[PDB]
Design an enzyme around this catalytic site. Structure first.
Site, PDB file in Angstrom:
ATOM      1  N   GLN A 105       0.824  -1.197   0.000  1.00  0.00           N
ATOM      2  CA  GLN A 105       0.000   0.000   0.000  1.00  0.00           C
ATOM      3  C   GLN A 105       0.859   1.248   0.000  1.00  0.00           C
ATOM      4  O   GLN A 105       0.465   2.280  -0.564  1.00  0.00           O
ATOM      5  CB  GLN A 105      -0.939   0.001   1.203  1.00  0.00           C
ATOM      6  N   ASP A 108       2.110   1.624  -3.619  1.00  0.00           N
ATOM      7  CA  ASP A 108       0.970   2.137  -4.372  1.00  0.00           C
ATOM      8  C   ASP A 108       0.871   3.655  -4.239  1.00  0.00           C
ATOM      9  O   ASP A 108       0.882   4.390  -5.235  1.00  0.00           O
ATOM     10  CB  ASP A 108      -0.309   1.448  -3.889  1.00  0.00           C
ATOM     11  N   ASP A 110       2.952   5.850  -3.512  1.00  0.00           N
ATOM     12  CA  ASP A 110       3.985   6.596  -4.224  1.00  0.00           C
ATOM     13  C   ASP A 110       3.665   6.714  -5.709  1.00  0.00           C
ATOM     14  O   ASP A 110       3.954   7.750  -6.315  1.00  0.00           O
ATOM     15  CB  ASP A 110       5.350   5.919  -4.042  1.00  0.00           C
ATOM     16  N   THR A 184       3.433  11.591  -8.445  1.00  0.00           N
ATOM     17  CA  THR A 184       4.461  11.308  -9.439  1.00  0.00           C
ATOM     18  C   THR A 184       4.537   9.815  -9.753  1.00  0.00           C
ATOM     19  O   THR A 184       4.361   8.973  -8.872  1.00  0.00           O
ATOM     20  CB  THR A 184       5.820  11.787  -8.938  1.00  0.00           C
ATOM     21  N   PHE A 186       7.193   8.188 -10.907  1.00  0.00           N
ATOM     22  CA  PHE A 186       8.457   7.632 -10.454  1.00  0.00           C
ATOM     23  C   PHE A 186       8.339   7.161  -9.012  1.00  0.00           C
ATOM     24  O   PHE A 186       7.679   7.789  -8.176  1.00  0.00           O
ATOM     25  CB  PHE A 186       9.585   8.677 -10.610  1.00  0.00           C
ATOM     26  N   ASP A 188       9.664   7.497  -6.071  1.00  0.00           N
ATOM     27  CA  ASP A 188      10.532   8.608  -5.682  1.00  0.00           C
ATOM     28  C   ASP A 188      10.214   9.201  -4.307  1.00  0.00           C
ATOM     29  O   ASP A 188      10.702  10.300  -3.993  1.00  0.00           O
ATOM     30  CB  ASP A 188      10.434   9.715  -6.737  1.00  0.00           C
ATOM     31  N   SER A 190       7.471  10.512  -3.262  1.00  0.00           N
ATOM     32  CA  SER A 190       6.461  11.562  -3.224  1.00  0.00           C
ATOM     33  C   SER A 190       5.555  11.449  -1.996  1.00  0.00           C
ATOM     34  O   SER A 190       5.124  12.467  -1.451  1.00  0.00           O
ATOM     35  CB  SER A 190       5.631  11.531  -4.511  1.00  0.00           C
ATOM     36  N   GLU A 258      -5.358   6.786   6.577  1.00  0.00           N
ATOM     37  CA  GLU A 258      -6.540   5.988   6.245  1.00  0.00           C
ATOM     38  C   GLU A 258      -6.668   4.756   7.130  1.00  0.00           C
ATOM     39  O   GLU A 258      -7.771   4.240   7.330  1.00  0.00           O
ATOM     40  CB  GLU A 258      -6.501   5.564   4.780  1.00  0.00           C
ATOM     41  N   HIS A 351      -6.017  -5.598  -1.485  1.00  0.00           N
ATOM     42  CA  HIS A 351      -7.252  -5.543  -0.711  1.00  0.00           C
ATOM     43  C   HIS A 351      -7.655  -6.912  -0.209  1.00  0.00           C
ATOM     44  O   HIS A 351      -8.343  -7.021   0.809  1.00  0.00           O
ATOM     45  CB  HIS A 351      -8.383  -4.935  -1.530  1.00  0.00           C
TER      46      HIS A 351
HETATM   47  C1  HEM Z   1      -8.548   1.044   4.110  1.00  0.00           C
HETATM   48  C2  HEM Z   1      -7.631   0.449   3.000  1.00  0.00           C
HETATM   49  C3  HEM Z   1      -6.577  -0.384   3.081  1.00  0.00           C
HETATM   50  C4  HEM Z   1      -5.979  -1.056   4.341  1.00  0.00           C
HETATM   51  C5  HEM Z   1      -6.588  -1.046   5.529  1.00  0.00           C
HETATM   52  C6  HEM Z   1      -6.072  -0.601   1.727  1.00  0.00           C
HETATM   53  C7  HEM Z   1      -5.011  -1.406   1.342  1.00  0.00           C
HETATM   54  C8  HEM Z   1      -4.406  -1.450   0.101  1.00  0.00           C
HETATM   55  C9  HEM Z   1      -3.213  -2.211  -0.291  1.00  0.00           C
HETATM   56  C10 HEM Z   1      -2.420  -3.150   0.636  1.00  0.00           C
HETATM   57  C11 HEM Z   1      -2.942  -1.949  -1.579  1.00  0.00           C
HETATM   58  C12 HEM Z   1      -1.850  -2.432  -2.544  1.00  0.00           C
HETATM   59  C13 HEM Z   1      -0.886  -3.290  -2.217  1.00  0.00           C
HETATM   60  C14 HEM Z   1      -3.942  -1.048  -2.027  1.00  0.00           C
HETATM   61  C15 HEM Z   1      -3.967  -0.581  -3.291  1.00  0.00           C
HETATM   62  C16 HEM Z   1      -4.781   0.435  -3.686  1.00  0.00           C
HETATM   63  N1  HEM Z   1      -5.898   0.905  -3.031  1.00  0.00           N
HETATM   64 FE1  HEM Z   1      -6.336   0.428  -1.109  1.00  0.00          FE
HETATM   65  N2  HEM Z   1      -6.841   0.127   0.855  1.00  0.00           N
HETATM   66  C17 HEM Z   1      -7.786   0.787   1.604  1.00  0.00           C
HETATM   67  C18 HEM Z   1      -8.744   1.622   1.111  1.00  0.00           C
HETATM   68  C19 HEM Z   1      -8.741   2.133  -0.160  1.00  0.00           C
HETATM   69  C20 HEM Z   1      -9.703   3.091  -0.659  1.00  0.00           C
HETATM   70  C21 HEM Z   1     -10.899   3.686   0.133  1.00  0.00           C
HETATM   71  C22 HEM Z   1      -9.380   3.374  -1.925  1.00  0.00           C
HETATM   72  C23 HEM Z   1     -10.160   4.354  -2.830  1.00  0.00           C
HETATM   73  C24 HEM Z   1     -10.962   3.598  -3.884  1.00  0.00           C
HETATM   74  C25 HEM Z   1     -11.785   4.589  -4.674  1.00  0.00           C
HETATM   75  O1  HEM Z   1     -11.778   4.487  -5.935  1.00  0.00           O
HETATM   76  O2  HEM Z   1     -12.440   5.479  -4.044  1.00  0.00           O
HETATM   77  C26 HEM Z   1      -8.196   2.612  -2.264  1.00  0.00           C
HETATM   78  C27 HEM Z   1      -7.542   2.645  -3.477  1.00  0.00           C
HETATM   79  C28 HEM Z   1      -6.406   1.936  -3.795  1.00  0.00           C
HETATM   80  C29 HEM Z   1      -5.549   2.105  -4.972  1.00  0.00           C
HETATM   81  C30 HEM Z   1      -5.736   3.138  -6.119  1.00  0.00           C
HETATM   82  C31 HEM Z   1      -5.029   4.476  -5.855  1.00  0.00           C
HETATM   83  C32 HEM Z   1      -5.411   5.496  -6.915  1.00  0.00           C
HETATM   84  O3  HEM Z   1      -4.632   5.692  -7.885  1.00  0.00           O
HETATM   85  O4  HEM Z   1      -6.504   6.110  -6.811  1.00  0.00           O
HETATM   86  C33 HEM Z   1      -4.573   1.185  -4.886  1.00  0.00           C
HETATM   87  C34 HEM Z   1      -3.399   0.898  -5.834  1.00  0.00           C
HETATM   88  N3  HEM Z   1      -7.836   1.857  -1.163  1.00  0.00           N
HETATM   89  N4  HEM Z   1      -4.829  -0.759  -1.010  1.00  0.00           N
HETATM   90 CA   LIG Z   2       5.946   9.032  -7.030  1.00  0.00          CA
END
Ligand code: HEM
Ligand SMILES: [Ca+2]
Ligand code: HEM
Ligand SMILES: *[C@@H]1O[C@H](CO)[C@@H](O)[C@H](O)[C@H]1NC(C)=O
Ligand SMILES: *[C@@H]1O[C@H](CO)[C@@H](O)[C@H](O)[C@H]1NC(C)=O
Ligand SMILES: *[C@@H]1O[C@H](CO)[C@@H](O)[C@H](O)[C@H]1NC(C)=O
Ligand SMILES: *[C@@H]1O[C@H](CO)[C@@H](O)[C@H](O)[C@H]1NC(C)=O
Ligand SMILES: *[C@@H]1O[C@H](CO)[C@@H](O)[C@H](O)[C@H]1NC(C)=O
Ligand SMILES: *[C@@H]1O[C@H](CO)[C@@H](O)[C@H](O)[C@H]1NC(C)=O
Ligand SMILES: *[C@@H]1O[C@H](CO)[C@@H](O)[C@H](O)[C@H]1NC(C)=O
Ligand SMILES: *[C@@H]1O[C@H](CO)[C@@H](O)[C@H](O)[C@H]1NC(C)=O
Ligand SMILES: [Ca+2]
Ligand SMILES: [Cl-]
Ligand SMILES: [Cl-]
Lengths: 595, 595
Positions: A105, A108, A110, A184, A186, A188, A190, A258, A351
């Site tokens: 997470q 992600d 970043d 970003t 990268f 990196d 952020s 979060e 998730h």
């Molecule tokens: C609460 C939430 C988490 C933990 C208690 C959790 C966990 C993860 C992990 C471990 C991820 C990747 C290895 C991961 C990826 C991405 N998530 Fe998630 N996540 C929790 C809650 C949320 C919520 C709320 C969102 C928003 C969804 C929406 O569309 O409203 C969410 C998103 C993402 C996401 C996309 C980021 C983006 O570019 O918008 C992941 C790559 N997560 N989560």
């Molecule tokens: Ca970045």
């Protein structure tokens, strides 16, 4: 006629060509084409968008326009019928610790972020949307199906607002809608320093000339620092225990608070940075504030790149590692460094790695106090369990010695996320991460399951038995075909995630291809990759190879006993060792008050 | 609290405030707070910023938000109805030579710069602003009013990009949008030496150890030098004659070659430093290059402070020189050396002094060649006419013997600037310096004319009759009123310049007040003032008080006939003398004996 024109509301900064430091927003990484990868641009598309009207409206918007002749199933219905389960006995992962998920997470956050839309301004339908369940412009509510339990308890829908999109942000067509990546691309850090310079400044201590990040002035953690408070009102963190009234933590990423282990990890990373700044003032008493911050920032970023690619990815990708991430051959300014739209759904496999409980442990990794094990749903946007329940030591201990949830075709996503998620604008513990992700796919115009199989060179199942063979699961395949009618309509999120995991990996074949490509393009297209000869002196490289998550925990907590491979399943004390055993990052090659 | 932390774009490099010279960056002049005066800082506010939304949006942005109950007029409309005139005959100032005009620009250019958000680079913000005229973000286009001839020939608007600003740099809301002063606030010759080190080091000759400024190898003015060229592309000076393709010069200030007489003055200044450098090596063959660089730099630094305060300010301010700049009572290190926001608009009084033509004059001050008098607008970013047409000596000769344009309530700005300004980016001689000024006060969130009269303890008229008496002009007052509805809404740049000049000066009372104050803080708050004790010996002070602009020309051109006051009107030969007359800069007290 060239499609390199659109993109009105965005900075346009000019570049220092031979500066040795990244920008904050990510501009100037690539020279021929300098906006590639910068924050606040459109997400890349590996396959053209697909919308109900070819333009912007999502599949399932008009209760009639099918998709290839079939109606699309309700997103909450796809959650109830495939994704949920009750019994948490035997769901954990015998080889992946809780740290395994948490680093996913963090990486992600970043790489990508597609935020919901500011609109809903000083007005009156960010609530009537929530209050009458009426689809409208950017309000795309998630409707409960018949007999859904939430009906008896939460009205007829869960709120949901669509993600922000480029050029005119509230307009009349714009080719196909394209969603913004607000961080970003990268790898990196952020998420530590921010992707916008108003924020990046506000997060630094500029009162002194030491290059530190600002730290909280209200509380401490046995003399170690916490993140400062985001003082804007109203606070979802204050809302969930108005007695305690502890705000959310202010960091480089909007999402830091979060959930409490994510917030725990943001602290480690920030503590590390400041740790570098005062070490480098020691070795180099002449270095100024700007020099110190910039040079520490470059080390924490390499620190993050090394852990991601040497310890994390091999155990995600397994047998597909070297087929997507072959040995680095150097920077390649032709590679696209942008994160794809479809990447922001492939990475949400984690998730299903989220377990239903979170533990605090004591000095000997035994339960800490009377309520050591708390349900996850009570820890969304929970900062007061850090400040006023022992700081971060008991939680980092839980990250090492407990386990991630394992993906499981009959137990996909915990109900703590599938029914009791909390969202910061709203007030109840009543949301469904699973339905959100499925509603977000369609909002983003994701192509079906079989467009991405074809894209990944994979077999494209057309029938039940074809699907049964791909998923190695006849019951599951039956349910999906009931719900979607043809594998061409399966939303990519549940699609990618339904496939059994590759060997020694934690995802299936489709998702391995998708993520594999994206991590390929973000090592090779980054002008500031750490292996890129010229970024770090060859002596500095050989210090940074000794980095570990274990050592990160040693240097920034009061934990004295940690494992050597923090990502695997480790028990106490057999697999634990002393913190002077582990290897340090040796700063001496950074001594440069040269003649 | 005390947010002394906002102000992101910054280094530090520390300093050496036991160092006998200035820094290039301007920091470390004040000891209590080192940054006061440094390049790349917020302009100071003598009054709070005033904006549509009280945050960042200029008045005039939203065609629906009045100021004090009335819409603000369009900038180009005010320019058409107030500032234009048709007959350049009789407009010249009978007792100010052309060098008076020029020397104002050179002082201004030393002190303040606020570059338009250079965020506009290979990108369709520039052209979206230009060809579609759509407001949005930093595009603040100047719409044409009804009947504007330029409708028929140039389109609907003139492009315009808001000035840069601190901590955030592209985005929005601040405690107030505070624009940036990109050069040092001190009268310090930063326009020659530059205001940041990167550029500052490149302008230097570090191939030999003589402490000289890099000079141009491609061309020479009869053995005298030129500024080195600027080889970055695209070159606007090449634009205005590709066949000649003589590039713009590269000096210590971005805008050195904006018009041919500005470049001329820059060439004189270079030639003086290197002169001091080589006459310093002679007295002291035991001095390195860096010592030669600084010591020459410092003298030239003093000369610019001398000419400005002894010879320029009395004739600009007149009867108000004493009240605002009384004689020197020493460095006062709690005086703010910063340039206020309003001052950068106050000093644009020099715009009304720029006449319609430029001459070239041979050794007898008669027209030089087959094309001696040239329209001003053919000479924006014009350097080939320097290097291909006689060099600077004919141009210098015009400055001495030709007159400035007098300000005039019915003849304010010549169409050469009001209708045919060349902007570096764009292709057409067709902009309007007048409209840009008024548009730019709104960008910079400037308060109105009566806010500024009050601040200077002046009467604040509310009526046609009160504004009539203030401006001593029946017709002009009504044209202001019908356009602005209340004097309170009159942009400072046009209100201040609309006032009759004070006796013996060249600005009205409001300007003399804003001009006077600032120059007083420019003197009292500079630790390195040429008359501060310890800075220079008392003996060296005796030297410098005899430098002359009439001397500086003799020492760096092949001109043998100069007047004793190059700043007033002087016709050849009644008021010209031979150079064997006008006192020299005896450099004897700069002789450092080994003992
Ligand atoms: C609460 C939430 C988490 C933990 C208690 C959790 C966990 C993860 C992990 C471990 C991820 C990747 C290895 C991961 C990826 C991405 N998530 Fe998630 N996540 C929790 C809650 C949320 C919520 C709320 C969102 C928003 C969804 C929406 O569309 O409203 C969410 C998103 C993402 C996401 C996309 C980021 C983006 O570019 O918008 C992941 C790559 N997560 N989560
Ligand atoms: Ca970045
Ligand atoms: C003071 C001063 C400024 C503002 C400096 C700052 O940015 O802090 C100024 C500005 C300009 C500009 C840019 C204006 C804008 O886009 O906001 C242009 C294009 C320009 C052109 C010419 N100027 Fe000027 N100017 C200032 C002062 C003066 C003075 C002072 C006595 C004179 C004289 C002068 C002359 C000219 C000029 C002559 C031919 C041109 C062209 N300027 N200025
Ligand atoms: C800034 O640095 C000093 C130490 O140099 C520290 O005492 C102060 O608390 C810091 N400020 C913040 C907000 O962290
Ligand atoms: C609220 O916070 C306080 C700590 O200040 C804690 O003691 C209390 O139990 C919390 N209550 C709930 C309902 O979370
Ligand atoms: C750079 O990337 C391009 C595009 O994928 C690829 O064709 C090329 O082989 C790469 N170059 C090198 C030197 O690896
Ligand atoms: C755990 O995973 C790693 C890498 O996938 C592997 O080396 C190790 O042997 C695994 N442990 C078990 C028990 O399979
Ligand atoms: C021109 O004006 C100046 C203003 O100070 C004045 O001193 C001078 O006497 C005037 N010209 C002549 C020729 O006297
Ligand atoms: C630097 O100084 C030496 C000494 O004359 C000269 O030969 C050389 O051309 C100079 N370079 C520049 C750029 O002025
Ligand atoms: C270009 O410059 C040459 C002299 O170098 C001159 O003869 C010619 O007129 C110029 N052209 C224009 C368009 O100014
Ligand atoms: C110095 O400037 C300060 C600025 O506040 C002012 O109060 C005072 O008049 C000045 N006094 C001296 C002695 O310079
Ligand atoms: Ca200066
Ligand atoms: Cl494994
Ligand atoms: Cl006079």
């Amino acid at each position: 006629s060239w499609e390199v024109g659109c993109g009105a509301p965005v900075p346009l900064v000019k570049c220092d060509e031979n500066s040795p430091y990244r920008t904050i927003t990510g501009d100037c990484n690539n020279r021929r084409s300098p906006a590639l990868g910068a924050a606040n641009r459109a997400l890349a598309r590996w396959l053209p968008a697909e919308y109900e009207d070819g333009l912007a409206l999502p599949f399932g918007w008009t209760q009639r326009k099918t998709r290839n002749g079939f109606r699309v199933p309700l997103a909450r219905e796809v959650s109830n019928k495939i994704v949920g389960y009750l019994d948490e006995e035997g769901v954990l992962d015998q080889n992946r610790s809780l740290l395994f998920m948490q680093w996913g997470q963090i990486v992600d956050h970043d790489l990508d972020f597609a935020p919901e839309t500011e609109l809903g301004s000083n007005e009156h339908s960010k609530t009537q949307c929530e209050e009458y369940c009426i689809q409208g412009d950017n309000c795309f509510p998630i409707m409960f199906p018949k007999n859904d339990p939430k009906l008896k308890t939460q009205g007829k829908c869960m709120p949901f607002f669509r993600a922000g999109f480029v050029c005119p942000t509230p307009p009349y067509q714009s080719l196909a809608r394209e969603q913004i990546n607000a961080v970003t691309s990268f790898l990196d850090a952020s998420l530590v320093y921010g992707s916008e310079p108003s924020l990046a400044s506000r997060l630094r201590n500029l009162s002194s000339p030491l290059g530190l990040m600002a730290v909280n002035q209200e509380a401490w953690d046995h003399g170690l620092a916490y993140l400062p408070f985001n003082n804007k009102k109203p606070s979802p963190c204050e809302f969930i225990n108005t007695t305690a009234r502890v705000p959310c933590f202010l960091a480089g990423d909007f999402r830091a608070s979060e959930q409490i282990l994510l917030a725990t990890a943001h602290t480690l990373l920030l503590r590390e940075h400041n740790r570098l700044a005062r070490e480098l003032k020691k070795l180099n008493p002449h270095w100024n504030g700007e020099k110190l911050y910039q040079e520490a920032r470059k080390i924490l970023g390499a620190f993050i790149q090394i852990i991601t690619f040497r310890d994390y990815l091999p155990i995600v990708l397994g047998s597909e590692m070297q087929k997507w991430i072959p040995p680095y051959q150097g920077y390649n300014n032709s590679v696209d460094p942008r994160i794809s739209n479809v990447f922001t759904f492939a990475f949400r496999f984690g998730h299903m790695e989220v377990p239903s409980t979170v533990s605090r442990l004591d000095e000997n990794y035994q339960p800490w106090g009377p309520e050591a094990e708390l349900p996850l749903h009570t820890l969304f946007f929970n900062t007061w369990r850090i400040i006023k329940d022992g700081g971060i030591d008991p939680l980092v201990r839980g990250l090492l010695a407990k386990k991630s949830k394992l993906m499981n075709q009959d137990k996909m996503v915990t109900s703590e996320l599938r029914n009791k998620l909390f969202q910061p604008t709203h007030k109840i513990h009543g949301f469904d991460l699973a339905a959100i992700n499925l509603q977000r796919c369609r909002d983003h115009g994701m192509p079906g399951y079989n467009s991405w199989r074809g894209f990944c060179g994979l077999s494209q199942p057309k029938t039940l038995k074809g699907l049964q063979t791909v998923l190695k699961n006849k019951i599951l395949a039956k349910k999906l075909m009931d719900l979607y009618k043809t594998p061409d309509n399966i939303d990519i999120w549940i699609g990618g995630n339904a496939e059994p995991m590759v060997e020694r990996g934690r995802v299936g074949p489709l998702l391995a291809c998708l993520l594999g490509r994206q991590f390929q393009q973000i090592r090779d297209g980054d002008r500031f990759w750490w292996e890129n000869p010229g970024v770090f002196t060859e002596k500095q490289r050989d210090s940074l190879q000794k980095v570990s998550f274990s050592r990160l925990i040693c240097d920034n907590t009061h934990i004295t006993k940690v494992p050597l491979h923090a990502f695997q399943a480790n028990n106490y004390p057999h697999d634990f060792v002393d913190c002077s055993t582990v290897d340090k990052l040796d700063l001496s090659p950074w001594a440069s008050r040269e003649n």
